[PDB]
Structure formats: structure tokens, C-alpha cells
Amino acid sequence: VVECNVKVIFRTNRIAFETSSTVTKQATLNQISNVQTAIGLNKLGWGI
Amino acid sequence: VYIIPRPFSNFGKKLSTYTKSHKFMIFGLANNVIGPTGTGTTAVNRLLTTCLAEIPWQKLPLYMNQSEFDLLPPGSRVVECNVKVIFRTNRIAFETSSTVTKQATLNQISNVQTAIGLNKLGWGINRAFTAFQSDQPMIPTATTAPKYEPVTGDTGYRGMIADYYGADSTNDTAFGNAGNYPHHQVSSFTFLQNYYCMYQQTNQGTGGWPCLAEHLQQFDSKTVNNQCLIDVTYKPKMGLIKSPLNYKIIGQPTVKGTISVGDNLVNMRGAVVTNPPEATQNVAESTHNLTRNFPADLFNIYSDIEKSQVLHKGPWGHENPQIQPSVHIGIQAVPALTTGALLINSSPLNSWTDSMGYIDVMSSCTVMEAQPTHFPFSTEANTNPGNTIYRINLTPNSLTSAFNGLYGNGATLGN
Amino acid sequence: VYIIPRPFSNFGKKLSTYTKSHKFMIFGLANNVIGPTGTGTTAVNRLLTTCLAEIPWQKLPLYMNQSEFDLLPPGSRVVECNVKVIFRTNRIAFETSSTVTKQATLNQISNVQTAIGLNKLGWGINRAFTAFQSDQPMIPTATTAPKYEPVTGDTGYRGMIADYYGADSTNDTAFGNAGNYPHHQVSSFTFLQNYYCMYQQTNQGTGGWPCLAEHLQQFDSKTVNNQCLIDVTYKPKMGLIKSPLNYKIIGQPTVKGTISVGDNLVNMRGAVVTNPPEATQNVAESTHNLTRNFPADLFNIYSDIEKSQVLHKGPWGHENPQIQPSVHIGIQAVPALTTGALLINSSPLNSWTDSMGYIDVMSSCTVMEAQPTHFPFSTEANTNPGNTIYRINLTPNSLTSAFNGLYGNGATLGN
Amino acid sequence: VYIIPRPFSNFGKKLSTYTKSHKFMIFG
């Protein structure tokens, strides 16, 4: 293998809608989410 | 000098045009869990399924209705005909039910996908209309002969023609608070009753599912939205769509001295041809071809309702003593199925949110012709063998496009 | 907008090249007293002989050896291949013997002669290897099937392959103080074991010996010396030199719905063809042709040592459902035989001074190919009928070039 | 002068390429 690449696009995310009122979890049309990417960590840092 | 000027009968050419704004609807058929052999006859075979709905830009009725077709003079041929479609939008459900699995969401991620040649050109089959599943009901289940004409097990379903146009001022089955509506004539949505898929069996030949993905494009719907993604057209290689013109038998010696044999040594090829691939194998195939040549002049259609008959007849209508080949391209519009929000535990993906796309399609075509006569008392339109036209008959279907290529259409009937 | 970019598997193409400096030797075969029928089967026929040695720029081994050939992937085809030769010089004997006739001389008059197309294109036959004469021993005597591969009456002589390359680290017959040497690999002269000549019988057809002289050029050797007189090349019309690529049987309807018949009305020619000249006569000939068309897909080679198999296979390998023709040109290098100084009384010319020419020949070629696969789990390289290739089989040899043209090679075996 | 030109076997290099559009899903 000479070189090999990956490119990714945050095509989008989807978050649920509590109908259930139940619990706790108040139902909302609001949405606050946030992507997070990372590279070397894996190999290079302190993890698994 | 003084030349006495000759006569002339210039027979003009009618050339019409037709259009129609169809409002088609597709469903996001969940990347159709392949159904094994649609028939108890091919039993050991399967169909990888797509939602790629098929726009019948080859069945005459997409372009014109009964009358318009009905009224075309003999020798009427479709010149060119086009389709342009607009991803007018798609709609995806909203799980209220919490039930199951399928977490309720105001989110939405869907994506259009169109494709052209695949059909005809690639390795697949249009097998559609179907028979299928309960909630998370987008994958389907019963294959079936694709429906263009109307089908019936005494009750009947369908009628492309009537789907777009309604019935006759008198026809019962339609007309009615509740029966077969004029749709097109009064804007209505109607579905694109055929989707497309790929066939393949088990052992007499084998290696895996080829890659559709690299033969159809996919857009982020919302992006491509309200924008037209189709607009390809076809100028049929031979679209004589009404019984041809009769050449008249009134010349002279032997060619009407008698109705005998008038044959001659030309030294140039003049008959239609045939390939018969001898597939035989013992762990991956071994073929053999044998060109078969054959005849010519008997008719083109009959039932009159053979408007629901195919368009490009390049493989059987040899015009005059010569030859040629080619297949009408094919075209598909649709949205990959929206996946349910199946939380946590899904580590199979098989829950599918119902979603329907409203694709706006306009179809048009030309077809045209002459009505000449070269004999003073001859009744009918008339020409000469110079062209006369000629068909090439066979026991079964001629190139049954409802079953996959080898570029031209095999002449036999699938599933 | 946002199109999701499709996949791609670009399978690269291996393209190699090969060369080799062969050191060939020719003899001035005395304008070969024609030998009557080399076989007790054609008994009444003859061969006007030339010294024109044949450079086998058509037998794969002239270009590459075992391994290189051996290691070519399926679908490997020779692209082009060339030969250039240099009249490195010739040597003529010196009669010491006074004996006979042949007056001793430090004089020398010799002359090179080369020729191209003759072979294939003209009216002759490569019949060589031979069986011959005592001093003034350049004319020869026994015709014989030309040797490229190895021949044997249990003892064996030859091996083009091994002549150039030697044996295997273990093979006895070679390797040894004295057995089958690596020649090429360690510069050695070796002979051009085939010379060329013309055939012709007695009564079923007749008029005399045509004129070779006007189909080969002759130089004053010494002039042309150490200068290359050949350098022509051939780009084979169809040089698939390794078993082709298998088209896989995994598309869909009928084409694998079953392994049945999938045939179709194309209306275009798609099968290989055949001429069968009906030579019949009563004092100079009378012919009749009858085009025969035929089949296609079974294999290309087997014994693996079919590297000693021919190069341009234009008359039998139809690639995909279509067609074509043509023959690899042919090439000859040599010196007209030096005449003895046969004084006074010679009023027949038949005394010939032994002389040998060292012609320096370099051969090269390209051959190349791909190794693609379009099915996810398919084992082997694989393509599609789109091309698949197809051979056309027969009982005897296909175009047995070792017996003279009619441009293409008759398919039957001579002498 | 006159050098007799040596042989040569240039073995070419296959060099392919591959791609694929995967559609992956993550959970928060």
C-alpha cells in the first residue's frame, strides 16, 4: 500500500424527541449538539 | 427552347408534439432486503433491490394519451422524446408511536439518487411492483412483472394510460366518486409503479453483488431540492409507432407480371441478424456464439391498445432491404431510505422510516409522418420497396425488456 | 448542492519489455539444388532453395525466455516487438586441399541478401532444417519440418528455448561439460536453424520458377558489413499470449437467472468467417469459394511450454462478439553462396565454397496487461462479455505457418 | 567502434487505486 486516505463529512446528526414525557427528560424542539474530531490521540496519546 | 414542366405532388409532413406534467411519487424502499426468486420457477435466485423508481420514458402513454396516439397516420414515428424531472421534495415520517424502535425525531437526513443507463446498459432488471412489510415497512416483498399496462386476476389493478387519463365518458370501472381518475388531466399525484433491482442466482455462475453505488449519483436531496435532476432525452433509432406504409405492387415485369418470386444476386448484405450465446460451464462459464440471419414485412401491432407497447424497436423493424441495432436508454429517480433513529443497540440496520418523494416530471415527444400516394387510383397511402419496412417475427417476445441485457435485450420472458 | 462521490477501483496495467542479443550464424547454402518431395507423401513436388535464414520473430522465445513468459498474467498481450540485425560479417573457406576443384584463393567475393515479406506474403515455404552433402557441401539435402520447438526420434535435437537459455539447475540433458548451454545468457553463437525455399510440384498446375531475385535485396556484404540491415518491427494485430480473462457469469435475468440460452436479434455481423477455395482443374486451375462462418470462447493454450507457440493470432482469437484478419510479416538474413574458383572447364556451376555469416540480432517486445475484478467476492481476475475474447476451434492446425499462404495461412500441415 | 547492446527485461509496475464511499453512523 503506498498511501491511503480518508476524508469525512459531518453529513449531520439526529437527536431524539422525548414524547414520553416520562422522565426526565422534558420534550423539546430545541437542539444543541456539537461534533468533535481527533487524530493522533489513539496511537500517540494515552488511551485505548 | 421550351421544356414542358413536369408534375409534382409534394405530400407534406405532419409533425406534432406532445407534453405532460406528471406528478409522480416514490417511496424510500429500504435497501431492499433481497427477495429470493419471485417465481416458483427460478426459485433459487435473488434480487438486490433499490428504491430507484422507473420513469417509463419508453412507454408511449407517458407522452401522449389515447386519442393523440390513436390518431397517428401510418408510418408515424416518434422522432425524439424527452423527460426532465425536478426533485420537488421528499417527506419523511415522524414516529409518534414511540413504540419501536424508532425514536421520534424532528431531525431529517435523506438523500436523492438518480441514475440513467444502468437499466438497459448495466447488469440488472426492472422487476417491480411488489408485495410488502409492516412498520419499518419500506423494504418490500413480492418481486413481480413490472407494471405498465394493466394487470388483473379478474379484479385488476393498474392502467398507466388510465392512471394518467381516466376512463371514457361511459366506462363504469372509472368515472364515479371513487373510480379511476383523470389524474394528469387534473394534476394528481400518482406513483411510479416500478422500482429497479438486480438479479443473480446460486451456482450456475458466481462472485458477489457488483457495485450499483458507482453507477448512480446521490445528492443531499435538500441541496438538490426543487431543482431538476433529470433531463435526458432519446431520439429512438427506429420508432415507427403506427403500422407502416404499404408498398404497392403495380410496377411491371415479373414484379407483378405475376406474384411469383422476383429474386436477385445483389452481393450486399440485406437481412436482419442474430446472436445465440451458448452459455455452458463447470465452475464459471464458457460461451459460444452463432450468427443467425432471418426474414422480413408482416405488421407491427395489434390490439389497438398497443400504445402500451414499447418505443424503440431498433432490433426488429428493418426498414427496406438493410440493417442496424440499439436499446432505448433507461432512467431512475429516488431517495435512499431514511434510517430509523434506532438507538444504542442496533448493531444490525434494519429499521426504516417511511418516506415518500414527490418528483415532478414533464414528458414530451414529436412523432410525425407523411401520407403520399403515387398511383392515380390507388386507394391507401403508398410508397415502394425502396423502403417499405420489414419486421422480424419470433415465437416469444422480441427483446422482452423486463429482463437484463447483454446490451440488446435477450428475446425470452423473466421471473 | 452535494453529490456523494462514487467509488473507483482503477486497476493498473503492467507493461514490461524484453530484449536479447542473439548471435546467429548462417551458411551460404549453395543455391540449393532443388530437392524433390521431402515426403514420401507429396513425392512429386520440389523445393527451389535459398540460403535465406529465418529469424523467428514470431516465436515468443526469440524475445523472452521461460520465466518471463511463464510469469505473464492472463490477458497478457504482446504489444509490438522488434528485431534489428547487423551484418556483423561472413567467413569463407580457403581450399588448401588443392584437391578439387576448387582452386585455393585469397580472393573473396561474397554478398549479403535480406528479405522481408516474402515468406508470408509471396509464394514459398519456410521448410527447413535439412540433411546434406559432402565438400562443395553448401547445397543441402533433406527438406523437413522447420524447427523451432525441439525435435526428437527418441534422442532429440533442438530446443529454441534451451538453445538460448540452457537447462534447469537440475536438468541432466543439459548443464555439464558438454550439454545444452546457456548461450544467450553468455554470448554464444548459435545457428539460425531454418532457411527458406519455394515449393511447386508437377502437373496439377504449371509454368516455371517465379523470380525470388525481385523480392529480396542483395548487397556487396563487405559494403553492408557491420552495418545493420534489418530493423523491421511488428505490432501483432491480436497477440493475446496468455490465457485470456474470464468474463464472469453474475449479472441478472436470464443471464444467470439460469445457465440457459440468452440469445438475441442484433442485426449486425458477429461471427468469425472462412474461405474454402475449391481448386479443381484440367490444364491450369478453376476455383470456387464458399464463406463459412463459425463459433467462439474455449481457451488458448495448453502444455505450458506453448511459449514455443505462435505470436500473431489474428485469424482465430475474435475478441468479444465481432471480427478481423492478418499475418505476422516474415524476415530473412544471409549470403549467396561463394562459388569455387572452378577453373577452365566448368561450364556447369556447381562447386561451392563453404562460408558462414555471423549475423548479430537483437530482439525485443513489450507485452502487458491488467488484473481487474468487478465482483466483491469473485475470486479470479474478471471482466465481461463486453470483451471476453473467443477462439475458433478446428480439427487440424489453425493457419499452420509452415506452409504457404494464400495471404492468411491455409489451416492443414505441409511436407 | 561497435558495442554489442546488452539485454534488458524491464518488468513494469502495477499500480492500482481504490475508493469507497462508506456511510457510517455514530451515537452520542
Please tell me the total count of domains within chain B. 1
Q: Report how far apart, in Å, the C-alpha atoms of B159 and of each of B85, B162, C78 are.
A: 22, 5, 58
Q: Decide: helix, strand or coil at residue B91.
A: strand
Least Cα separation, residue B230 to chain C (angstroms): 14
Question: Cβ–Cβ of B207/C250 closer than 8 Å?
Answer: yes
Cell of C107: 580472393
Q: Where are the beta strands (DSSP E) in B70-215?
A: 81-92, 111-114, 150-151, 157-158, 189-191, 195-201
Range of the domain at C317: 14-384
What percent helix, strand, coil does chain A show, rounded to 5? 10, 0, 90
Size of interface A-B (CB pairs under 8 A): 27
- Chain D residues within 8 A (CB-CB) of chain B? 21, 25, 27
Q: Which residues of B touch C270 (CB under 8 A)?
A: 273, 275, 289, 291
- Say how many C-beta atoms besides its own lie within 10 A of residue B343's C-beta: 12
Pairing assessment for the beta strands B18-27 and B189-191 based on DSSP bridges: parallel
Q: Find all residues with CB under 8 Å of B238, minimum gap 6, and list them.
A: B77, B312, B313, B314, B317, B319, B324
Least Cα separation, residue D25 to chain C (angstroms): 16
Per-residue b/e over B39-75, b at no fewer than 16 CB within 10 Å?
Answer: eeebeebbbbbbbbbbbbbbbbbbbbbbebbeebebb
Of how many residues is chain B composed? 415
Q: Find all residues with CB under 8 Å of B345, minimum gap 6, and list them.
A: none
Phi, psi of B273 (to 5 degrees): -125, 180
Question: Cβ–Cβ of B343/A19 closer than 8 Å?
Answer: no
Q: Which residues of B touch A29 (CB under 8 A)?
A: 106
Q: Find all residues with CB under 8 Å of A21, minimum gap 6, and list them.
A: A27
CB-facing half-sphere around the CA of B349: CA atoms within 13 A = 13
Please indicate, yes or no, if residue C64 is contained in any of the structural domains: yes
Least Cα separation, residue A44 to chain D (angstroms): 23
Q: Which residues of C touch D8 (CB under 8 A)?
A: 17-19, 364
Query: What residue of C is the nearest CA neighbor of B397?
Result: C264
Pairing assessment for the beta strands B45-54 and B195-201 based on DSSP bridges: antiparallel
Residue D2, amino acid:
Y
Least Cα separation, residue A38 to chain D (angstroms): 15
Residue B270, amino acid:
G
Q: Which residues of D touch C11 (CB under 8 A)?
A: 14, 16
For B406, which of C295, C378, C385 is closest by C-beta distance? C385
What percent helix, strand, coil does chain B show, rounded to 5? 5, 25, 70
DSSP class of B121 = H
Please indicate, yes or no, if residue B97 is contained in any of the structural domains: yes
Please indicate, yes or no, if residue B35 is contained in any of the structural domains: yes
- Chain D residues within 8 A (CB-CB) of chain C? 2, 4-21
- Neighbouring subunits of B (3+ Cβ pairs under 8 A): A, C, D
Question: Cβ–Cβ of D12/C15 closer than 8 Å?
Answer: yes
| Whole-angstrom distance, CA of residue C247 vs CA of residue A3 | 31
Sole residue written with cell 414516529? B95
Question: Cβ–Cβ of A17/B104 closer than 8 Å?
Answer: yes
Q: Find all residues with CB under 8 Å of B273, minimum gap 6, and list them.
A: B291, B292, B293, B294, B323, C265, C266, C267, C268, C269, C270
Q: Decide: helix, strand or coil at residue B305.
A: coil
Q: Find all residues with CB under 8 Å of C146, minimum gap 6, and list them.
A: C54, C126, C127, C128, C129, C194, C402
Please indicate, yes or no, if residue B396 is contained in any of the structural domains: no
Cell of C127: 521448410
DSSP class of C259 = B
Least Cα separation, residue A3 to chain B (angstroms): 22
Sole residue written with cell 419499518? B136
| Whole-angstrom distance, CA of residue B26 vs CA of residue C234 | 58
Q: Find all residues with CB under 8 Å of B143, minimum gap 6, and list them.
A: B35, B37, B38, B39, B47, B127, B128, B130, B415
Query: What residue of D is the nearest CA neighbor of B342?
Result: D27
Please indicate, yes or no, if residue C411 is contained in any of the structural domains: no
| Whole-angstrom distance, CA of residue C324 vs CA of residue B158 | 50
DSSP class of B177 = S
Please indicate, yes or no, if residue C9 is contained in any of the structural domains: no
Query: What residue of A is the nearest CA neighbor of B101?
Result: A16
Q: Taking Cα atoms as reference points, which of B404, B406, B306, B312 lies closest to residue B72?
A: B306
- Say how many C-beta atoms besides its own lie within 10 A of residue C284's C-beta: 9
For B344, which of D21, D25, D27 is closest by C-beta distance? D27
- Neighbouring subunits of A (3+ Cβ pairs under 8 A): B, D
Query: What residue of C is the nearest CA neighbor of D15?
Result: C12
Contact C331, C57 (CB under 8 A): yes
Cell of B130: 411488489
Cα B131 to chain centroid distance, Å, stands at 21
Residue D1, amino acid:
V
Least Cα separation, residue B106 to chain C (angstroms): 22
Question: Cβ–Cβ of D27/B343 closer than 8 Å?
Answer: yes
Q: Decide: helix, strand or coil at residue C164.
A: helix
Phi, psi of B394 (to 5 degrees): -155, 155
Please indicate, yes or no, if residue C78 is contained in any of the structural domains: yes
Contact C80, C232 (CB under 8 A): no
Consecutive H or E run containing C120 = helix C118-121
Q: Where are the beta strands (DSSP E) in D1-28?
A: 8-10, 17-19
Q: Report how far apart, in Å, the C-alpha atoms of C279 and of each of C207, C282, C287 are.
A: 17, 11, 5
| Whole-angstrom distance, CA of residue B312 vs CA of residue C117 | 50
| Whole-angstrom distance, CA of residue C141 vs CA of residue B196 | 74
Q: Which residues of D touch C76 (CB under 8 A)?
A: none
Q: Which residues of A touch D15 (CB under 8 A)?
A: 2
Cell of C109: 567475393
Consecutive H or E run containing B219 = strand B217-219
Question: Cβ–Cβ of C251/B200 closer than 8 Å?
Answer: yes
Q: Find all residues with CB under 8 Å of B134, minimum gap 6, and list them.
A: none
Query: What residue of B is the nearest CA neighbor of D21?
Result: B213
- Neighbouring subunits of D (3+ Cβ pairs under 8 A): A, B, C
Least Cα separation, residue C374 to chain B (angstroms): 6
Consecutive H or E run containing C163 = helix C160-165
Method by which the coordinates were obtained: X-ray
Please indicate, yes or no, if residue C271 is contained in any of the structural domains: yes
CB-facing half-sphere around the CA of C160: CA atoms within 13 A = 27
Query: What residue of B is the nearest CA neighbor of C4?
Result: B218
Please measure the distance between the N-terminal and C-terminal CA atoms of chain D and give it in whole angstroms.
Answer: 79
Cα B100 to chain centroid distance, Å, stands at 39
| Whole-angstrom distance, CA of residue C274 vs CA of residue C255 | 30
Pairing assessment for the beta strands C111-114 and B332-333 based on DSSP bridges: unpaired
Question: Cβ–Cβ of C263/B272 closer than 8 Å?
Answer: no
Sole residue written with cell 394519451? B65
Query: What residue of C is the nearest CA neighbor of B415?
Result: C253
| Whole-angstrom distance, CA of residue B179 vs CA of residue C375 | 48
| Whole-angstrom distance, CA of residue C386 vs CA of residue C393 | 21
The resolution, in Å, is 3.6
Contact C60, C241 (CB under 8 A): yes
